[PDB]
Design a protein around this ligand. Structure first.
Ligand SMILES: [Cl-]
Ligand SMILES: [Cl-]
Ligand code: NI
Ligand code: NI
Ligand code: NI
Ligand code: NI
Ligand code: NI
Ligand code: NI
Ligand code: NI
Ligand code: NI
Lengths: 138, 136, 136, 138
């Protein structure tokens, strides 16, 4: 383990706004929030360049009674058995379901999976969260 | 004063990767990059959400052997039994875990809960996704 | 009359495996084996559970492309929004899915919900696990 | 596809009790219930003999604040990354958690995983459900 200490210069008003927000959010200090910003930045780069394994989640909301969205979702998901780990489903109301799919594999592959799922007519709301397996982060 | 200079300590491995990336992009120094990361952060955390009823997910990744993140995560979640429906956990490797927490409630409170979870010491990365179970 | 004779139709693949197994065990005929399966079934479905508050899981496996099991499962679950907390789904292969439904409520109603789910046409196999969140 | 029709003789009172129960449970008919009994019987055999892949779930309940059960559970689970697919956790009350772990792999391996998890002091209630991947059933 090795910690490297270095200095940086940030516009004073920008920094003031930052400190105000991170406190409200719940961060204990500025260094923790900035390290998080850097981890986030590195993860985004991981999804842009390379073939390294990444992980993500795809959250969707739909009316299971409308059209063939239910059958369409299953067929798409079963087409990617290697990338999709599992999914959590919550019955919102009589007709609406919330589903979150956990995926792990190559970035391009996962982005295509999200494109297919989210572009479904029956999917009303949806979002892909790009994160990490944590292996390459500390 | 226009600029405020201060120090920060970061594990070398993490700083190495950060330096490589910003060099490629064409950044002249670390302060420029971090300045941009901070501005984007503020912008994303300033958008208003309202207070309607929403359903969402909070995705997080962490090393379960780091500090007391595991205990902190559980205690924090058990305080909001009403908003937290369930959580899905995937063991990534010997140390890393990915967790997805499904929530439902007033947008204000949900945002607040997500903020606390994501800012917990030990959480490496995470994102909140809030949606209105209504029409597209 | 002591014995009642009747017929049943079964996919050949399934019957082949069943025959192999009962032959090994030393069963003299299919009626002996099925008789035992029926008796055990009755015994397991006669134990009383009460009506206290319980939390449980219903594990099921099915071919999502078979009949209307997928629609039936969803409709049935959406009728009990109060007892069903969430469900975890794992895609086993091109056709088979494993699902685990977490439930909470009065033992009587939970048992009834589990019975309906497990007896739905299309469900290949499944089990209910009911527990009292209390002390061991 | 080939359906084989055959006859069987069951003690009359046993059959009467069976028909009564399956109706109450929700089965449409006696043939469906019996085919389910046969599938269940074949799955049990799959967990006894062979090395064929099986699937199961381990449901447990514990007080996350008591002793080191939380840390113990994670360490055990992370020791079997290949067999454990994912887990669903529900916060029962201020202190009690319900967790269900989905596993897939070899029977002996999974039974040992359940032995370790269920034998934990902090685990108050628990049960392994032995089922199938569905691949070998119809
Ligand atoms: Cl300062
Ligand atoms: Cl008859
Ligand atoms: Ni299909
Ligand atoms: Ni639903
Ligand atoms: Ni606690
Ligand atoms: Ni884990
Ligand atoms: Ni419906
Ligand atoms: Ni599936
Ligand atoms: Ni550990
Ligand atoms: Ni809990």
């Amino acid at each position: 383990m090795e910690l490297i200490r270095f200095s940086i210069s940030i516009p004073s008003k920008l920094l003031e706004k930052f400190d105000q927000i991170i406190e409200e959010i719940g961060y204990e200090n500025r260094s923790e929030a900035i390290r998080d910003l850097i981890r986030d930045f590195i993860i985004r780069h991981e999804w842009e360049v390379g073939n390294e394994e990444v992980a993500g989640t795809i959250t969707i909301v739909y009316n299971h009674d409308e059209g063939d969205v239910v059958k369409a979702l299953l067929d798409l998901q079963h087409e990617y058995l290697d990338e999709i780990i599992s999914s959590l489903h919550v019955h919102m109301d009589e007709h609406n379901c919330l589903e979150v799919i956990v995926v792990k594999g190559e970035a391009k592959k996962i982005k295509m999976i999200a494109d297919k799922l989210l572009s479904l007519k029956g999917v009303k709301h949806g979002k892909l969260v790009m994160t990490s397996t944590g292996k390459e982060l500390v």
